[PDB]
Design a protein around this ligand. Structure first.
Ligand code: SAH
Ligand code: ZN
Ligand code: ZN
Ligand code: ZN
Ligand code: ZN
Ligand code: ZN
Ligand code: ZN
Ligand code: ZN
Ligand code: ZN
Lengths: 479, 761
């Protein structure tokens, strides 16, 4: 019934200073637990991997978090990246950890031992991502400029590098790598201010003497943002990306891109033939008045104020069947933001109904909340002269007209309407969506990563000072 | 009926569609995404962490926890500190030596092009123009103002861009605008959409990006010249491709190809073939004119392009002993007698000064004499500036303004692309005198020296007869050990055919990678070539800005460099030493300058390769270098170049064939981005280049074989479309004008297309 419930701060912990500047750079929940299993997450500081388990409780004073493991990378590197994998034989959880000396350390977290090391990159690794299509496929983005696709499958044991996204894609350090749900598309971004979309080939079930080298992305642009891009992710076929010095998370789309269409081959990719052009695409549609059609479209801008000149700050969407899509992000001035994407359309249906009733009833419109009484019942109260529009209960007051005066029985104030449009209006691609919930933190906190539990009842934000903030919704606390 | 105020008022009402539509689009795209959320996959049967209990304690580390509750904040207690045992795990592997970019292998040097408040404003405006552009025509129909059509608005705009561009626009658009309400609309569009304060657009910015605006920015021989225009302008004299790694890149990324238009276009070369033909003093299987005369029945009416084909084939076949009737016949699909009759109707008609020999060079005896190294710079590549080869009627003298003789401090020998002949010109390079039952063109035992070795050039497969460079410079015989035991010995780069080498960590303190011998190499053997991107001195400077450098000076005076940063070969890893075991040399290789490494000592498998980087490094103004196989046993770790897997001695040596499709594709797209070429042109040029670039031709000796492979392979594709055979005959005409194609090859191409068409019929 509480599908509209957004998270609240429940627990918070400071982990011992382990780099003497100590920060948790990553947080990732284990995604292969059976339905109903208590969620387990891993927070990666510069030197440690802190594996926690979160348990719902009836006591507000009880601790839901229990550190079930604390590993220490005993190498001479500092880490920033993580992802979860599985042992292809025993189905045991593996935690991949990457750092500044360019290797991926895969840990057997239950047995407390190293599974293997993945060597090959020629610079520090800034990000790791696992394929939603294959738990054994891992992508690593590095300072060396390349993305490496690794396979933990037994077939590739001898030579684990299945693919290299190299060539003319990137010119500076990569800060982000993201996979499509089909596991065939990859997004990469970094310091060169380019976002690339790469199409992965099919990987043979046998030994590969050398990886498949990909040289050209299928979509490439440096025009979505005007600074280094440090977080890139897919939301369906839509892209969400974040850049330094912009105070926004951009929702945008590649024109002509669909994952329903057959995956293009490597030789289908556009090549830089004209050095002037800062956007090139294989997907670009045929029909447009433009000789050079718009290859992407800016859709919306989530307003993430006060981020300053900080970079390596990442967001995360909770995207699961039968639950609302929640975007969470924490800035550089102790604030955690949340957007319930399911609110947009409800607001959109509401505003359309309200404009229609305003036109049809010459402004005589009465608004009644969806929390009882009924549309047919309300019409029966105000008569034929007045139109009735149903409002979502969460849309609380303070080309749609505002009431002529405060004491008017029809409509809302300009203040009420401007407050709603700030948070839910999607008509302006260069507008600013106000967070639906902004939760303050004490005292100084720069957020590095956000993570969601499989059931979405837990949201963990990690950052500077080795701090972890745990937010919860749908609690069992008996106050 | 209309006024600026009323259109501006109307546009403001229509413009409300834009935020309405954007909101419907965004919401639609979001609803579709929610409904299509991924279902979680690869879920386990059991909770893998079930048996793991809390590691808390009242090598360990501390964690303090705080509990919160309420609408705002809020710490419940003060917190709770806890000790936790730490599991120390140490990695079982060292990272591989560091690098930047993916290092991709290239068979030969490739051509590279040259590489804020306004940026933000322009982008904000471009994005805005992009969103409004699709609304203009729907709005124009809704408004239905007399003479307010997009074409009339473009017409109005062109009646402030360059004067020429306004005329190109007016050419195809006219002045048929009256009632020029197109003024009142422009004024109203700029009041509404071009308000200064951002994001904004003037009607001209939308119009300028419209698909019908943006892209619009003797007698027999004049026809034939224009007809063969694309082939003479882009077709390469060296490798025969239309988008290749030969040519100059100007300061702007415009390219001067090394084509027939470098050698004064078609006519000089054509005239010379015709003259040669005069001095020189099997019917087709498609109703030959040699058996059927001129017909007597009635034929379909010939087209412009059909008569054109007969025209350029007639001209380029010239005063032959091979006839155009057969070839044109097989190109068009018309009988042979048909074109013979057309040719009869058209009534088509076709249009040695004794020089004193040089005291420093004899081209008859094929040898240099009496202090030739002070009389020329032919061998001195470092001081040689590149100019176009000869294309003048007179003798090759300074007095006649011959570049070969006068352009440099000293004259240079006239190379193959100079239009002068071996008889009329004393400066002409003629080849090798060299002939032996054993090894010749060294490096020479038997007889007089090798003029090629002397002039720092590899032998010419065509000029160096009884060498036998012809069969030894053939890449098809690269691994014929038996053949290469015999004469020449001076075709290493053309063979390539490099010694087995292996990548590893260098023995030099903190050097990163090194190249190690994976085979015993004898003194004076060819090791490897230095490949990379060909760049200018300036482009190299831009790359040096934004510890490790891969530049190599190729032609110093000319200002050309080889950069192996991304593209090159394993030779990029060879480290410096004052006294190395190998040496670079700059070689003239069929009008290409290439760097080869030669062993100066006997090197054993496992031994590291070193060379002296030169003037521009203390581990024992552009900075850059200058002048049954198994994995060996070594103290240094070795690695696969691609995978970076550590190698183990005794394992079969990794030897990966180069896949250059990524590079072929860039040449395909470079032609696809040409406005000057018709699609019929690009369809063929791309088809030919995809094919010919794969063969890495450097000499005209091997072209007739690959031309014939192309006819045999593409025959059905060529005969299946009128424009393809038309384009192919353009190529064949250009190649015949150059004297690159033997008559017999064209005669054979006739029979390939004739049985192709017959079979398809
Ligand atoms: N004799 C020498 N002394 C010092 N550095 C050397 C050297 N020979 C080679 N180098 C190093 O090698 C670079 C040339 S690139 C050669 C490959 C390189 N070792 C790599 O790991 O990729 C130089 O810029 C320098 O850093
Ligand atoms: Zn060429
Ligand atoms: Zn004939
Ligand atoms: Zn001359
Ligand atoms: Zn000359
Ligand atoms: Zn000459
Ligand atoms: Zn010789
Ligand atoms: Zn020779
Ligand atoms: Zn020879």
């Amino acid at each position: 019934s509480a599908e509209w419930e957004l998270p609240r701060l429940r627990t918070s912990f400071i982990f011992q200073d382990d780099y003497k500047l100590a920060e948790f750079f990553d947080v990732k929940f284990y995604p292969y637990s059976p339905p109903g299993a208590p969620p387990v997450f891993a927070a990666t500081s510069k030197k440690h991997a802190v594996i926690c388990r979160l348990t719902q409780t009836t006591d507000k004073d009880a601790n839901p978090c229990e550190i079930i493991q604390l590993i220490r990378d005993d190498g001479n590197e500092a880490n920033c990246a993580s992802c979860w994998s599985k042992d292809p034989i025993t189905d045991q959880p593996l935690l991949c950890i990457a750092g500044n000396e360019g290797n991926v350390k895969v840990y057997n977290v239950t047995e407390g031992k190293l599974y293997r090391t993945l060597v090959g990159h020629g610079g520090g690794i800034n990000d790791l991502a696992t394929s939603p299509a294959n738990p054994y496929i891992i992508a690593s983005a590095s300072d060396d400029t390349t993305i490496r696709i690794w396979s933990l499958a037994p077939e590739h044991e001898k030579q684990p590098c299945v693919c290299i996204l190299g060539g003319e894609g990137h010119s500076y350090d990569l800060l982000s790598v993201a996979f499509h749900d089909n596991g065939r598309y990859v997004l990469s971004a970094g310091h060169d201010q380019v976002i690339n979309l790469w199409a992965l080939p099919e990987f043979p079930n046998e030994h590969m003497e050398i990886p498949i080298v990909i040289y050209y992305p299928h979509f490439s642009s440096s025009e979505i943002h005007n600074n280094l891009v440090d977080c890139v992710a897919f939301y369906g076929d839509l892209i969400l990306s974040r850049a330094c010095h912009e105070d926004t998370i951009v929702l945008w789309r590649i024109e002509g891109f669909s994952s329903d269409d057959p995956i293009p081959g490597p030789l289908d990719a556009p090549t830089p033939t004209d050095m002037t052009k800062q956007t090139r695409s294989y997907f670009t549609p045929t029909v447009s008045p433009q000789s050079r059609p718009a290859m992407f479209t800016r859709l919306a801008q989530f307003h993430t104020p006060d981020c300053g000149v900080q970079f390596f700050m990442r967001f995360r969407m909770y995207h699961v069947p039968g639950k609302h899509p929640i975007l969470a992000f924490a800035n550089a001035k102790s604030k955690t933001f949340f957007w319930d994407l399911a609110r947009f359309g409800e607001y959109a249906r509401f505003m359309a109904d309200l404009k229609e009733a305003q036109q049809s009833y010459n402004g005589r419109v009465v608004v009644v909340d969806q929390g009882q009484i009924s549309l047919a019942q309300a019409q029966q109260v105000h008569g034929p002269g007045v139109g009735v529009v149903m409002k979502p209960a969460w849309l609380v007051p303070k080309m749609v007209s505002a009431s002529p005066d405060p004491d008017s029985p029809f409509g809302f104030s300009r203040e009420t309407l401007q407050a709603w449009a700030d948070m839910y209006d999607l008509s302006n691609p260069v507008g600013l969506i106000k967070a639906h919930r902004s939760l303050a933190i004490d005292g100084a906190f720069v957020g590095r990563q956000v993570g969601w539990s499989p059931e979405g009842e837990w949201c963990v934000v990690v950052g500077n000072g080795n701090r972890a903030l745990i937010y919860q919704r749908w609690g069992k606390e008996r106050g | 009926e209309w006024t600026v105020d009323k259109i501006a008022s109307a546009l403001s009402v229509l413009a409300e569609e834009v935020p309405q539509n954007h909101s419907r689009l965004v919401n639609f795209l979001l609803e579709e995404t929610e409904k299509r959320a991924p279902q979680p996959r690869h879920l386990s049967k059991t909770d893998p962490f079930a048996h793991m209990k809390s590691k808390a304690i009242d090598p360990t580390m501390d964690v303090k926890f705080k509990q919160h509750s309420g609408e705002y904040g809020k710490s419940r207690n003060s917190g709770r500190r806890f000790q936790y045992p730490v599991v120390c795990i140490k990695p079982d592997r060292e990272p591989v030596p560091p690098y930047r970019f993916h290092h991709a292998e290239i068979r030969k040097n490739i051509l590279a092009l040259n590489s804020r408040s306004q940026k933000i404003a322009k982008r904000a405006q471009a994005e805005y123009a992009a969103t409004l552009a699709p609304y203009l025509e729907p709005w124009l129909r809704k408004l239905n103002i007399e003479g307010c059509t997009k074409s009339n608005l473009i017409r109005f705009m062109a009646s402030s861009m360059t004067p020429q561009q306004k005329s190109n626009l007016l050419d195809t658009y006219s002045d048929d605008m009256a009632v020029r309400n197109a003024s009142m609309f422009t004024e109203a569009w700029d009041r509404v959409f071009n308000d200064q304060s951002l994001r904004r657009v003037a009607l001209r910015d939308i119009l300028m990006l419209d698909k019908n605006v943006e892209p619009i920015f003797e007698a027999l021989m004049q026809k034939v010249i224009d007809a063969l225009g694309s082939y003479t302008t882009l077709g390469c004299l060296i490798c025969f491709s239309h988008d290749c790694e030969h040519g100059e890149i100007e300061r702007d990324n415009q390219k001067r190809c090394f084509s027939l238009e470098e050698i004064g276009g078609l006519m000089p070369s054509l005239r010379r073939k015709w003259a040669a033909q005069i001095e020189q003093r099997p019917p087709c299987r498609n109703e030959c004119y040699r058996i059927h005369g001129t017909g007597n029945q009635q034929v379909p009416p010939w087209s412009e392009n059909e008569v054109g084909t007969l025209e350029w084939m007639f001209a380029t076949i010239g005063y032959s002993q091979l006839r155009p009737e057969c070839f044109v016949g097989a190109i068009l699909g018309r009988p042979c007698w048909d074109v013979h009759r057309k040719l009869q109707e058209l009534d088509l008609r076709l249009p040695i000064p004794k020089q004193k020999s040089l005291p420093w060079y004899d081209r008859r005896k094929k040898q240099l004499m009496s202090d030739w190294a002070d009389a020329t710079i032919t061998h001195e590549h470092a001081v040689r500036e590149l100019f176009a080869p000869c294309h003048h009627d007179g003798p090759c003298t300074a007095a006649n303004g011959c570049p070969c003789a006068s352009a440099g401090t000293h004259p240079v020998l006239c190379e193959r692309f100079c239009l002068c002949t071996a008889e009329e010109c004393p400066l002409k390079f003629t080849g090798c005198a060299c002939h032996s039952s054993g090894k010749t063109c060294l490096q020479q035992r038997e007889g007089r020296p090798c003029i090629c070795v002397q002039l720092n050039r590899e032998c010419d497969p065509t000029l160096c007869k009884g060498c036998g460079a012809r069969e030894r410079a053939d890449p098809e015989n690269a691994y014929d050990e038996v053949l290469h035991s015999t004469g020449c010995q001076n075709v290493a780069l053309q063979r390539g055919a490099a010694k087995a080498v292996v990548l590893g960590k260098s023995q030099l303190e903190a050097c990163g990678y090194g190249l190690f011998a994976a085979e015993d190499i004898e003194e004076g053997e060819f090791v490897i070539e230095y490949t990379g991107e060909l760049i200018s001195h300036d482009e190299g400077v831009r790359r040096e800005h934004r510890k490790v450098s891969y530049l190599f000076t190729l032609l110093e005076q000319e200002g050309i460099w080889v950069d192996a940063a991304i593209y090159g070969n394993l030779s990029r890893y060879i480290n410096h030493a004052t006294d190395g075991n190998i040496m670079p040399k700059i070689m003239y290789v069929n009008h290409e300058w290439r760097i080869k490494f030669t062993a100066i000592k006997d090197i054993k498998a496992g031994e590291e390769l070193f060379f002296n980087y030169g003037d521009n490094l203390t581990k024992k103004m552009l900075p850059g270098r200058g002048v049954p196989l198994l994995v060996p046993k070594t103290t240094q770790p070795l690695f696969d170049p691609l995978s970076k897997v550590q190698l183990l001695p005794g394992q079969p040596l990794p030897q990966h064939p180069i896949d250059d499709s990524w590079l072929l594709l860039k040449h395909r797209d470079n032609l696809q981005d040409f406005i000057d070429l018709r699609p019929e042109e690009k369809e063929f040029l791309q088809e030919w280049d995809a094919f010919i670039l794969r063969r890495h031709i450097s000499s005209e000796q091997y072209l007739p074989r690959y031309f014939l492979r192309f006819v045999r392979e593409k025959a059905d594709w060529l005969v299946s479309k009128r424009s393809r055979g038309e384009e192919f005959s353009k190529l064949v005409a250009t190649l015949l004008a150059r004297r690159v194609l033997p008559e017999r090859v064209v005669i054979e191409a006739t029979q390939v297309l004739n049985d192709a068409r017959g079979r398809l019929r």
